[PDB]
User: What shape does this take?
Amino acid sequence: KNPSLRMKWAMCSNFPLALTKGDMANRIPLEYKGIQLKTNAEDIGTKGQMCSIAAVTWWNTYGPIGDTEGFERVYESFFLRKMRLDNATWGRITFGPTSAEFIEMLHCLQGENWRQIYHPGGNKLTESRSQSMIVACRKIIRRSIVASNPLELAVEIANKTVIDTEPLKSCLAAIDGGDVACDIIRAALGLKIRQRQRFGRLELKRISGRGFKNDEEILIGNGTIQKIGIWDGEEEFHVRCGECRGILKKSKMKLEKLLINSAKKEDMRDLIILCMVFSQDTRMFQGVRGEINFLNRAGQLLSPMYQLQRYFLNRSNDLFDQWGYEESPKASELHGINESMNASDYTLKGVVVTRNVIDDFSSTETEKVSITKNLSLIKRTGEVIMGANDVSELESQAQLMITYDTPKMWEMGTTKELVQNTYQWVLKNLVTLKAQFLLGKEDMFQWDAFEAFESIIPQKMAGQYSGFARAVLKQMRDQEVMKTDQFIKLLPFCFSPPKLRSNGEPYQFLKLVLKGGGENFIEVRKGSPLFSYNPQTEVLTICGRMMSLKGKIEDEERNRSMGNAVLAGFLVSGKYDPDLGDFKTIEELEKLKPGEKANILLYQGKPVKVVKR
Amino acid sequence: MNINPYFLFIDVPIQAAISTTFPYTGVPPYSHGTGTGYTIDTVIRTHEYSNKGKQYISDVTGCTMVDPTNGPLPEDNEPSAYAQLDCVLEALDRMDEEHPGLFQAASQNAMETLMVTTVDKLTQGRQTFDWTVCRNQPAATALNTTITSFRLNDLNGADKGGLIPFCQDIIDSLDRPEMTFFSVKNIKRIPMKVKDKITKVEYIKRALSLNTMTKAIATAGIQIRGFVLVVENLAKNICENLEQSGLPVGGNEKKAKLSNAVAKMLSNCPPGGISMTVTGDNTKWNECLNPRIFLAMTERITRDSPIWFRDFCSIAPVLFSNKIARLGKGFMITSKTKRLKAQIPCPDLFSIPLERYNEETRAKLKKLKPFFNEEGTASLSPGMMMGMFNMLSTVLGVAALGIKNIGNKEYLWDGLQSSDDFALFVNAKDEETCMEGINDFYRTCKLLGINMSKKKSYCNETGMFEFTSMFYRDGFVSNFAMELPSFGVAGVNESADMAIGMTIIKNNMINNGMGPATAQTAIQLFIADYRYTYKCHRGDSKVEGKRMKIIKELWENTKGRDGLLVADGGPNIYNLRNLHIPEIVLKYNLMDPEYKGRLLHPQNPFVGDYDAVSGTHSWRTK
Amino acid sequence: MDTFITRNFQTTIIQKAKNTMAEFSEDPELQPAMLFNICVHLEVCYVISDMNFLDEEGKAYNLRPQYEVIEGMPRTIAWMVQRSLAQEHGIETPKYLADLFDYKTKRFIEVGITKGLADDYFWKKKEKLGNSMELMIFSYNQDYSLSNESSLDEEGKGRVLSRLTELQAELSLKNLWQVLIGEEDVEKGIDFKLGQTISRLRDISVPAGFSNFEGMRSYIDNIDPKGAIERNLARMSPLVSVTPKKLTWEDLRPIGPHIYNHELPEVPYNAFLLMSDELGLANMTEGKSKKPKTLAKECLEKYSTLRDQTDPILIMKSEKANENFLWKLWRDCVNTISNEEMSNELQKTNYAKWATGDGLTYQKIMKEVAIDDETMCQEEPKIPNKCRVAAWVQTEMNLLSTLTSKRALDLPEIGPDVAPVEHVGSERRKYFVNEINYCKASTVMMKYVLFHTSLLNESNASMGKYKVIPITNRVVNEKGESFDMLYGLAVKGQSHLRGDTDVVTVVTFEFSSTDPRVDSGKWPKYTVFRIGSLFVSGREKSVYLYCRVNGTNKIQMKWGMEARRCLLQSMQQMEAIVEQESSIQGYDMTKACFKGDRVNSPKTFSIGTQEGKLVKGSFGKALRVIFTKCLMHYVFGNAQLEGFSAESRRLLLLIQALKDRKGPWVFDLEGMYSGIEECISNNPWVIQSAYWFNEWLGFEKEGSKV
Ligand SMILES: [Mg+2]
Ligand SMILES: [Mg+2]
Ligand SMILES: [Mg+2]
Assistant: This one.
């Protein structure tokens, strides 16, 4: 009644797996490199041959290669599930108080106290170019926002971004579509974009009226005073949101008219909510009975208008409840919608659907807007038209491979592609890096590749790691000759300022761990799953992608011992003397008095001896 | 500084702070209420609450039956089994009034499902008593033994396939003058099958017997499962249409039920009035509910049904009103000076003077003597031993919650029922009338046989309560106990085990309210257990073994290492979003063509719920 | 199958039939033949009813039809319509759910579809139903059976037979005629008869006041019970009442005050292994996994002085212990581990039989001899002692929540995060493991789990002999070094049985640096020898060996192995705290709770008292305290602790209601307190929990006034 223990014991047995009889069953060798894969035993009556799990390993490694055509056809449902998952778009996760394609993701969509917004995808492959362009622009904006002087970083990254094979600038200039992020990037690169006011997902084009912002202290439903710039006077705009459009006529803290056309229910709801929030109706302000402290990915506090926008997008019922209701006229063209966007005469107060098609404002209006430091676009008149706050937060995977040839984007790796890129960058610039290093100049540590590398070093230990690496490099340079492999391995860690202990010496380490451990570590004195080197074949295997290291090596850095650059302040001396004691822990090594001797174990079979300087 | 854990409550609500106080939902290894002493205690307690009612002798079995129903009303606040039939009937009539056609629809649906059910269905349950061997056997084993022994007696109903003929044979076997069966005897020993015979009365006692469990403390035989199935189906059909019923619910819709109940009660409060909620506990729920009341409930529910279905439904409460409790292994008497021990079985409990039992057991036996049959079994006519009629008991509770008023007073009550757990809500004008309503509900419950716990139930203004271990406070919801994943692997095969583990984590975060971080940690722990059990650590690791030696070579040879399965030393790519996709399907696109061909070889010699892709890892073990 | 059903039946019919089937069947998609039958039945019903019409007085042409369709709709509504029609037309309501209602003759109608032949299915339906309702039987082959002449005419008949012929031809030519099932099989079983034994048992299962089951049946079926509840409530005694009382702070008194009685003994340590007093002998390695015997061998080689100590210096002795037996067992374990054999078998099995006390087992005899022997009596139950608070539980809580230099947790990886919820979970896990990686409780939990795993692994065929199970662990420090830690050796006894609950004796000898005489009342269950001295950082520490004869079983071994779920328990509790915090806002508050944002400062908790004043700490300290509390709850778990934790929840919720100003009311507060207090006898965790609850309740009382 304990299957787990039974199976654990069975796997520890010799031949626990039943084996069939046939040509393929007889292709398994009796034993591989001393491992008995199949039993050479004949059962008395059953004639049942057995094998070891090592037999399955051998079959998967060297066994005959069968044909794998039509495999996707048989298991089509599972591949459809994977396709739906991969093509899906992820929104935002909200805390506090169904199609079969959604029940699959129920575990990742609905929680007891949280809810995840999820838009399923699949076979939306026609417009891959525009989708990839918008994904790239959104990622660039997100990266640049968290940086001081976002405009400079955004323009620098956007020039080094390639979608499939065409530069992002070419895609932006050609496609002409996109979203707020695409427009921001275009105006950052000096291109031209269509002229529309932006409030979240709402595109506005004034067609009559005037407004003047007045600073005021308004009270909200939750009972707090907020400083808002209110719009006074009667204004009329053409409003659009996704596939829905309409006309909004508003006045001071009041929505007069909101004519719209039938469209997607979610899109219509978003349009109506954004129109209510933009109207600045006091009826909207009074409906805020929660807490509005939403921040942005930069960590800063959203402005009050966007605070209310986010709140009411999350909690739409709180507004429709405190929005009142009325009865629409029986005109054939005119209609009305309830809180659920249905056909009901009991419609919202000030909102009305219509049958006649409303002409879109999206005429060709290519213009050259001005972009400020914080990714805000302003007309020649000085009025801000869009900003970073209006960029959609939806996330999806690009249908075309996008490559950002810049270290600033390396942070979007998996902590293994980041290491791969960083170490390949060191190897490519190894000659120049070493030439600069052998001059007493240390600005090399400030390069952007090491900036990206520091993003995976534990913040607690980053200073100590950097101090140890810098001390080891200085020892390898000044007082002794250099070892190229250790120089490459320990250079990236040098970015952070040293965090030397009170003793005036660096923290000694046996391994340097990175984010997402288990196998993400660098051995200071031995090969690692993320960085290994062959001292004789001159091969630098980074994550199993062996790269040659011919020429950059030196003849004098081969006879030298690996133990000269394994601990800061310790230089190899003597040999493996079994008189001082066992292989001392690092703890003894830091505590050792200067000039003393110690024993070390570089790896399995290479003892050495060192002396503190 | 002295660390006080309880000070966490000074900064966090107690509902959030006591989340998952128990990491399990099963019985611990130490809190085991099993033994002859516990069974005798249950019998004495059950008859204690009904000793003011009728008592007579059974004309069929000869046991001493006690009937509390329609007995005198209680005069104190002790547990009472003296439910009044008229009050139960009025509650059920009002429940039918509030839901027109619900009783009829439930009866018809249960009847149709019964007409479609097959004898094979009495094999999905837990251990069952076996009269042939007088021992607990798995449902399939007991069913097969009963079918064979019935064929021995010329009762062939299981062959027809339908469950109704099998139940007909079950109840007709009660009229046989004497029943012959196959008994397994350790005749060195060996389990040899012999043709044994018993008389009608002994067989009747065996069919009404409920053995004690050792690994619910009582188990029933196969004679009653067929009828309990239909009775519980009828009860569930009634329960799923009641807004108060909350037992069938599970997952994120349980929180929805709690929130909807709270909001509905708050909205209907009188302007300027007060709404209170009582977190309720029931005392001796199992020991104070009578099978006679359940017979009356089934009779009222199936009023308009055809008589055959009415009788079929009445059979189960009939068989549980005449039940016999087997008292277990017996006691153990030891001589300290002689260093000797011996187990006195149940038939020989009174074969020695009671002065040789400790005080508590001596008193227990003194009280048990009247109801002690001279075979090691006691008579337990009143009470519902353990969970056997959970749906029907929930129906009775919800019927109690449907009265809503007494004497047309200034209060209205509603609530949630989950069998013996419940929450009450009372709307009135002030706390005084609210407590008046709570008192009236307590008295009505007493009249119905339900005993609210005063020592465990309490009250406070609506907006915070607990239901079925789920704490609700201002919308936020927490759980007191959660069955966190056990440790190990399912043990089927390395291909299936990954699917089973990932499905377990997925269902835990769907139903049991597991969080993202907890689920990711569970994934990590399961992968650790998987790699430990199947010796399939990563190919780039430094681990020695027979299979790991070849896994390392496979790692070195393969180029698309991210496509290798975990069983092949490949990386683990499971996260929250992709717990429903087989790992072969996940890694197909990244698999090397040669490795994919070898693994997906239709002619490999190894192959010979959860979703898995057949391959060299879907092997078999003898 | 689904393709044909979609093609030959309109969407409305298919959905209605699917609903009708799903009402009674929990696996509707596993039996499409039934679906075929119901959709055909609905087609026939519509054909009968859709066309035939009527008018006001008698015209069989307005919009009044002559057929009312009760089928195809939810049964709840169907039963209401059936009862309403029967009552309105003064006719009886059939006990079944009819298919149609004929308005010309005012009769319920049942229509049947027969594969074999009509006039045979007709009589079966007559037997099932009888004179309750008329019948219309139409067969696949041209045939019909009607019980009335004024019923369906020839045109509707021709339409329905044409439909049946089309379906039959399609089934025949698409090889699905084998799947068809006659309606008879759905009705299988209506002849259910009660025997003589079951009838007599039924007659004597009726409540008081009924002679036989027929009287009860008639009484329930005919008597209107209106007014029974109020009738019985008016004549019920006033003494039956909840007796509610408005709870106040003054009602909440300290629980289990007897724990403050200084005349009682203080609780002794009774956990399986030493938690905070543990001392592990450390030996660095390269991370390579080793056999437990080899790990112990190398660790004992590194410490030869302790291993070679052959004479005992007894420091403390348990009252009933035999220091000679224990020391000889310890020496046997050391010799067995140090030997070159690949087995962990003890050499002196016969001596170990009596050293562990396994030979002192009572001899089972025949029940007859025992019955005759008047000196054999049942033993009185062991009443758990009543003990007072001991400072060692508070010290254990203080020490186990601190950070150490070693971490025993190394968990595998998971796929990359792509969804925001996954990023939330990853961030939460990052903070949790950062705060918990080097907690002492983590290493203690891993030691417990590994020890119980070793105990269970050695029960395959080694339950009939004496083994030595090293108490081992593997840890890693911040510098990346890996150590094997040996905390002692345990000899695992032998149970001749294999019942999964038979007691197996484990004699544990654990290293420690704690003088047992400093806290005398903590160690009455242990016999302690001073086995040597150790140097750690130039400081000499005495090394004692705590020896104890404990017992366990396979279930307890599995439970101790499961003890690793305290990690998931703490993760879930932290998640619940963070989710409660983020419900007030609309976004995840993990970073704000842990590190603090620009708007939200880092969250702080009250972690204890220093000299009677509240002391605050970060969320990491609170996390460590939560983990330690979970670990101690698991280690000290028993019936008393389970009862205490299940019962004090109600008091805590009452206190929460008092704090929230929800105006709690209680019916039996003294009953609550007695139920809580009956569990405070000798469990150290329960007694310390009562102490902590009393202290925190005093603090809450004081803070309520302000
Ligand atoms: Mg319950
Ligand atoms: Mg409750
Ligand atoms: Mg029908």
